[PDB]
Design a protein around this ligand. Structure first.
Ligand code: CLR
Ligand code: CLR
Ligand code: CLR
Ligand code: CLR
Ligand code: OLC
Ligand code: OLC
Ligand code: OLC
Ligand code: OLC
Ligand code: OLC
Ligand code: OLC
Ligand code: OLC
Ligand code: OLA
Ligand code: OLA
Ligand code: OLA
Ligand code: OLA
Ligand code: OLA
Ligand code: OLA
Ligand code: OLA
Ligand code: OLA
Ligand code: OLA
Ligand code: OLA
Ligand code: OLA
Ligand code: OLA
Ligand code: OLA
Ligand code: OLA
Ligand code: OLA
Ligand code: OLA
Ligand code: CFF
Ligand code: NA
Length: 389
């Protein structure tokens, strides 16, 4: 069958992907620019990620359409056309890893997050990562290429000029670069690092949430021991334990919460002094006042701390879905390259499967705006306003 028929389907799908990638991620950038509630360090890497996806539609997809034709070109010009998408993929990887690290810092050390993770430092990290992406992705242009050994018979059959080659990806980009350097070192290792970071984030969240519940139970259990205690020493043992737990849990709403813990510790000290004097009944009656503080203050702190953690678990899952989708989207093309490289006795993957793998990789530049709309309310609402207005 004529090559332009099969090409037409591939080309049309590529253009449709390019349009969607541009529109969706331009909307992401426009939402962050307009909504100050979306202007945080986490969303600065989201914008950098969206910028890479906009460049996929504007440049990488037209480059992929061009290189599918095998047109005659100077080999190093062809290399740029072949490698630029690797720059964008590398940048995306850096942004995805930065988002994962950012969410770990926020959940593991929230008391020092604002002082450690700032917008100015984030912009500096984004700039460095872009420079690194260019270096990694354009490494073939540094000499790790096949331009020294051009397919002369293919170039002559296509009427290429002297010094030109038929511009095809696998003719100019070495497969040992694609598999060992790009896939294994620069894609697989960072993705396994993100998985590691995500596991730590979820484990930290779970651990925190049994700590909140453990403290709620413990306060309640120690109130029961005091009620059915029969001597002053037992009341003292329970109160002593309580006081330590109250200070451990203390480490508009913040003013009433600090006042709630000032009442709690003070009421524990009142009953402790009565227990040390041997006045058991008085100590017990004083410890009963703690239930008033628990209902009006402590329980509200427990449902708000728990609520905050849930929101973090939710936000970490949304970010992990984005990283997972990147892996799902790019792995097929990388796995095919592994078969091409590691099995010279296997027939090369057919052209239609190469096209399918390539389009799948490009579809990843479309999916992120939909994940933000379906999982993050502040993005969703902002998208509605932009579209309406
Ligand atoms: C700012 C943005 C829009 C600029 C985009 C510039 C792009 C399209 C330019 C920059 C470098 C250019 C390449 C430089 C070298 C060659 C070799 C030549 O034998 C065929 C064209 C080809 C492959 C060019 C294609 C167009 C090209 C890729
Ligand atoms: C931000 C501005 C400066 C754009 C920078 C891009 C320019 C400087 C780069 C990008 C790609 C480069 C080209 C890539 C490959 C080739 C083919 C080679 O046979 C001659 C040089 C030539 C044609 C390069 C010239 C310089 C070039 C056009
Ligand atoms: C990451 C998830 C989606 C798994 C993706 C699995 C895909 C990429 C795997 C599964 C089966 C694989 C194919 C199995 C057998 C062959 C025949 C060989 O002569 C060329 C490669 C080729 C055609 C493989 C290409 C890659 C392949 C299609
Ligand atoms: C954590 C996971 C996603 C790591 C990625 C797994 C990759 C690296 C694995 C999965 C399946 C593997 C392929 C399975 C079968 C063959 C055929 C053999 O003749 C050469 C190696 C080759 C081509 C393997 C190369 C590596 C491979 C592509
Ligand atoms: C060439 C690439 C263009 C796309 C990059 C576009 C990036 C511009 C988006 C600006 C943005 O979203 O930033 C919000 C604001 O800067 C927070 O203070
Ligand atoms: C051929 C084209 C080559 C272009 C390649 C790189 C260009 C632009 C991407 C960078 C845009 C990423 C924007 C990130 C958001 C940001 O910078 O916001 C930080 C905020 O200002 C903190 O105060
Ligand atoms: C911001 C908007 C961005 C603008 C994006 C524009 C969209 C055009 C898409 C692809 C270009 C590919 C052009 C095709 C190049 C091949 C020409 C050629 O020579 O191929 C014939 C070959 O010789 C036979 O073997
Ligand atoms: C507007 C986008 C039009 C993009 C035009 C792309 C040119 C298609 C082309 O040149 O055909 C493919 C090649 O000839 C077969 O291998
Ligand atoms: C904002 C900037 C937007 C402007 C971008 C221009 C649009 C498309 C470029 C596609 C290149 C067209 C390829 C034509 C090459 C050609 O004529 O073919 C050579 C022939 O095969 C040998 O004799
Ligand atoms: C604002 C962003 C705007 C960016 C638009 C870029 C679109 C397509 C790239 C086309 C790649 C180069 C096309 C090659 C055609 C060509 O050079 O053919 C002549 C022949 O191959 C020499 O012998
Ligand atoms: C985790 C990545 C590890 C995957 C490593 C797969 C290597 C495949 C391989 O080495 O197969 C070559 C075989 O010797 C050809 O004769
Ligand atoms: C594939 C090539 C990889 C490149 C390896 C060497 C590059 C090392 C770069 C490190 C970035 C460190 C950040 C330092 C910022 C200082 C900027 C300044 O001078 O003010
Ligand atoms: C959701 C499941 C995927 C749906 C569509 C995927 C279709 C492509 C799947 C390909 C698996 C194997 C492809 C076989 C290629 C022929 C092997 C050869 O001749 O070398
Ligand atoms: C849908 C996007 C429209 C693109 C139409 C151009 C046809 C592709 C081709 O020329 O092979
Ligand atoms: C991909 C789908 C997202 C596109 C939905 C239309 C909104 C785009 C408008 C805009 O550019 O801001
Ligand atoms: C193709 C290039 C795609 C990039 C588009 C990104 C759009 C997002 C932010 C750009 C900043 C907005 C500039 C004018 C703002 C006017 C205003 O604030 O009302
Ligand atoms: C900027 C918008 C793009 C403008 C025009 C699109 C037309 C591109 C023509 C491709 C030429 C293909 C060829 O001659 O083989
Ligand atoms: C490696 C390439 C280095 C590029 C320097 C770009 C700007 C870096 C300075 C900002 C550092 C920061 O604030 O974290
Ligand atoms: C390698 C040679 C140079 C490659 C690209 C140079 C720098 C690229 C992008 C600038 C950084 C992106 C903007 C950061 C937001 C502030
Ligand atoms: C920075 C990383 C890559 C930039 C390389 C520029 C390529 C110039 C090639 C010139 C030539 O080979 O004729
Ligand atoms: C800082 C690093 C920037 C590297 C600068 C220039 C590299 C581009 C020129 C390479 C041309 C030769 C490539 C080759 O050997 O095939
Ligand atoms: C992280 C994933 C990379 C880990 C190991 C790379 C495997 C070593 C390469 C295979 C042996 C070389 C060969 O094919 O003979
Ligand atoms: C091939 C490596 C796959 C890892 C993908 C990286 C994103 C992590 C996603 C989910 C981990 C959370 C449980
Ligand atoms: C290889 C990765 C495969 C699938 C990733 C899809 C979504 C994973 C995110 C987990 C959410 C917790
Ligand atoms: C989800 C992934 C994107 C969905 C679009 C899948 C459909 C077509 C992708 C291109 C396949 C090329 C068609 C036949 C090419 C050929 O026969 O050579
Ligand atoms: C040929 C497919 C063209 C575009 C592919 C996009 C498919 C998935 C994208 C967004 C999720 C839909 C909601
Ligand atoms: C390839 C992408 C497949 C599935 C996820 C895309 C649509 C997201 C909606 C939530
Ligand atoms: C990343 N990538 C491509 O972008 C590509 C390709 N073949 C054609 N293109 C465009 N291969 C094998 C590839 O690994
Ligand atoms: Na991306």
């Amino acid at each position: 069958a004529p090559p332009i028929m099969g090409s037409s389907v591939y080309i049309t799908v590529e253009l449709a992907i390019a349009v969607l990638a541009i529109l969706g991620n331009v909307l992401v950038c426009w939402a962050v620019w307009l909504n100050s509630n979306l202007q945080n360090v986490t969303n600065y890497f989201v914008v950098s990620l969206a910028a890479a996806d906009i460049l996929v539609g504007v440049l990488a997809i037209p480059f992929a359409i061009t290189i599918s034709t095998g047109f005659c070109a100077a080999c190093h010009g062809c290399l740029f056309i072949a490698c630029f998408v690797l720059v964008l993929a590398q940048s995306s990887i850096f942004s995805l890893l930065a988002i994962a690290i950012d969410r770990y810092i926020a959940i593991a050390i929230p008391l020092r997050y604002n002082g450690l993770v700032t917008g100015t430092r984030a912009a500096g990290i984004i700039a460095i990562c872009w420079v690194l992406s260019f270096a990694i992705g354009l490494t073939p242009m540094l000499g790790w290429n096949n331009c020294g050994q051009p397919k002369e018979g293919k170039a002559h059959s296509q009427g290429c000029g002297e010094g030109q080659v038929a511009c095809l990806f696998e003719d100019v980009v070495p497969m040992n670069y694609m598999v060992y350097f790009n896939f294994f070192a620069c894609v697989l290792v960072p993705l396994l690092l993100m998985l590691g970071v995500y596991l730590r984030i979820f484990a930290a969240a779970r651990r925190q949430l049994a700590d909140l519940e453990d403290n709620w139970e413990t306060l309640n259990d120690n109130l029961k021991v005091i009620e059915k205690a029969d001597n002053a020493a037992q009341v003292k043992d329970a109160l002593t334990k309580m006081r330590a737990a109250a200070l451990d849990a203390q480490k508009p709403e913040m003013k009433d919460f600090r006042h709630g813990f000032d009442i709690l510790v003070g009421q524990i000290d009142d009953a402790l002094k009565l227990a040390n004097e041997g006045k058991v009944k008085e100590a017990q009656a004083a410890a009963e006042q703690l239930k008033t503080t628990r209902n009006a203050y402590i329980q509200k702190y427990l449902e708000r701390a728990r609520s905050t953690l849930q929101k973090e678990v939710h936000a970490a899952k949304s970010a992990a879905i984005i990283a997972g989708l990147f892996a799902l989207c790019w792995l097929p093309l990388h796995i095919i390259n592994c078969f091409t490289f590691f099995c010279p006795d296997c027939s090369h993957a057919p052209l239609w499967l190469m096209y399918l793998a390539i389009v799948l990789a490009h579809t990843n530049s479309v999916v992120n705006p939909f994940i933000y709309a379906y999982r993050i309310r502040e993005f969703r609402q902002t998208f509605r306003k932009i579209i309406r207005s």
